[PDB]
Every structure is written in structure tokens, then in C-alpha cells.
């Protein structure tokens, strides 16, 4: 009965579509409208259930450890495998480089995963002791736990941001300096903006094009388009030696 989950190729289709829609929003110059009505673009029914609320870049040794906003934890290891620990303290899911998923438990698991389990526990403990939870102000909706828990598909960092791409399609961009964050959902064609005051607001992209938005959000969306391009192909299709 279990769903196989949205497959990565299907995620890539929606990503390309979001790339195109970001281009369209951005080319519409949304901060230049006669009267910007950003509030009218809000779409509360499309609020994301999941985002990365904490992260640790130990990629020099092991990988990128993270917490999701339901307090589950995961790691994308340097061998492109993922281990996630659900918020019950014991349930695990292991995802191989090719996406093959297996379910296990901390109490009952193949011995082959002992090392990666122990590393995940170290990441968890670190995050819990040291790091602030992003979106700690959002109270979950009833049944949000029924949505498929995603894993971190890919990530990268620039000088100004970290880019986190989840297996449900979402692309999260966290800006280092000012703590502002974007959560782009290519399935809902929506974007959530977390501003410097920690206000969390979810917009329909097509409505940002219709109604406009402030220049800070407009600026972050220009950068987002560039990040999506990089995600889709780290190297340019017009010159594969050149970084997207």
C-alpha cells in the first residue's frame, strides 16, 4: 500500500518549471508596480509542512547534518547517501545514492549502518545543544505528520547563502548575514519568505507577478533564480566547463 514517493526525475520537471516561473516573476519587475499589493499574493493553504530548521556543515569529514522542523534529523553523507531519524527517537530510513529506500530502527538495524547511525546521533546532539530552530514560531497543523518526511537530496553553499534541496521538491535558501530565508515549492508554485523579524509568509508565485512585492523579496527572488539554475545543472549546457 505504501506510496513510493515523488521520484527525482519528476522533481526535476517541476524544478525546471519553477526556474521558468522565477524568470517570469523576475522579468515582470515586481517591486516596480504602480501599487505593490504583496499581501494579496499570500496563499496560506500552501504553507510548507517541512523545512530545514537547523544544519551543520561537517562535509570535510562526514557530510551535511540537519534538523527538519518536526524535530526529525538527517544527514546527507559525503557518499551521497542519506540517513534520517524520525522524531520518535528510533525509526530510521536509509536512502542509497540511487534513491533506494530502506526502513529500520535504531534498536534493530543492519550492523552495516552502525557507523552512520552513530554519526547521525552526534549531529543530532550538536544541533540540539547549540543551534536555534528556524520557524520555531510555526505551530503544526493537525495531520501534518501524515505528509511524507523528505530527505536532503542535494545542497551547496555560496559566499552569501546555503541552498538545501529536499526530496519533496522544495528548495530552501538561507541567507547567512541577515538570517532571511526562502522556501520554494515547485509542486505548489509557491514561495515562503522568512524575514529578518522572523515573520513567515507564503505566496503564490503567479500572484507575486500579478500584484508585486517589496524590493527585498524581489532581490532575493532574483538570486533564487540563479540558485535554481545551479541546482539543475552545476555546469552550463552551453559550456560544460563553466559553472552555472
Amino acid at each position: 500500500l505504501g506510496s513510493p514517493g515523488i521520484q527525482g526525475e519528476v522533481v526535476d520537471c517541476h524544478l525546471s518549471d519553477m526556474l521558468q516561473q522565477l524568470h517570469s516573476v523576475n522579468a515582470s519587475k515586481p517591486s516596480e508596480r504602480g501599487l505593490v499589493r504583496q499581501e494579496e499574493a499570500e496563499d496560506p493553504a500552501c504553507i510548507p509542512i517541512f523545512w530545514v530548521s537547523k544544519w551543520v556543515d561537517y562535509s570535510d569529514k562526514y557530510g551535511l547534518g540537519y534538523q527538519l522542523c518536526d524535530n526529525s534529523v538527517g544527514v546527507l553523507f559525503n557518499d551521497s547517501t542519506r540517513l534520517i531519524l524520525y522524531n520518535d527517537g528510533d525509526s530510521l530510513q536509509y536512502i542509497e545514492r540511487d534513491g533506494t529506500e530502506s526502513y529500520l530502527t535504531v534498536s534493530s538495524h543492519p550492523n552495516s549502518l552502525m557507523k552512520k547511525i552513530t554519526l547521525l546521533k552526534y549531529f543530532r546532539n550538536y544541533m540540539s545543544e547549540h543551534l536555534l530552530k528556524a520557524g520555531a514560531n510555526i505551530t503544526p497543523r493537525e495531520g501534518d505528520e501524515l505528509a511524507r518526511l523528505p530527505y536532503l537530496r542535494t545542497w551547496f553553499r555560496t559566499r552569501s547563502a546555503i541552498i538545501l534541496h529536499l526530496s519533496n521538491g522544495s528548495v530552501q535558501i538561507n541567507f547567512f548575514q541577515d538570517h532571511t530565508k526562502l522556501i520554494l515549492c515547485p509542486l505548489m508554485a509557491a514561495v515562503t519568505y522568512i524575514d529578518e523579524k522572523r515573520d513567515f509568509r507564503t505566496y503564490r508565485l503567479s500572484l507575486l507577478e500579478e500584484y508585486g512585492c517589496c524590493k527585498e523579496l524581489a532581490s532575493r527572488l532574483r538570486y533564487a533564480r540563479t540558485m535554481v539554475d545551479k541546482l539543475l545543472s552545476s555546469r552550463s549546457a552551453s559550456n560544460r566547463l563553466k559553472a552555472s
Binding site: 537547523k54 551543520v56 553553499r157 538561507n174
Partner: peptide, 8 residues
Amino acid sequence: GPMTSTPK
């Protein structure tokens, strides 16, 4: 660049 998300 920072090696973690925002600290407590």
C-alpha cells in the same frame, strides 16, 4: 563562511 546554522 559559517559552518552551522544560526546558534542559540
